[PDB]
C-alpha cells in the first residue's frame, strides 16, 4: 500500500477533483469480504506499474459517507476512473489484473 492515496471526504475535492491527470478510486468498507480483498493486491501492482501515468487511491465508505452518494455508488468494490475532474468510466465488483489493465488501457488514450 505505499503508493495508494488514502482519501477522506475532506480531501477528495483536492486530491481527486483538482488533480492533474488520472486517478483510480477504490470505494470499499471492511464489511466487503472476499471481493475487496481480492482486488487490493492487484491495485498495489497497478499503482507501481502505472507510476506517472495514473494515481490509485482508496476511500472507505463507512468512515467517509458523503462521497459515494454524489457519484451514485450502489455496491463496493466500485472503481471509478477520474481524468482531470471528470468520471471517465466505472468498474463494479472484483476483477482480475488482466481485465483491470484492459479497463485502464482503453481509458487512458
Ligand atoms: Cu505499497
Curated annotation (Swiss-Prot):
Give residues where N6-acetyllysine occurs: 70
Top-level division of the source organism's lineage:
Bacteria
InterPro entries per record: Thioredoxin, Thioredoxin-like_sf, Thioredoxin_CS, Thioredoxin_domain
Q: List the disulfide bonds.
A: 32-36
Cite the entry's keywords alphabetically: Acetylation, Disulfide bond, Electron transport, Host-virus interaction, Redox-active center, Transport
UniProt similarity note: Belongs to the thioredoxin family.
The name this protein carries in UniProt is Thioredoxin 1
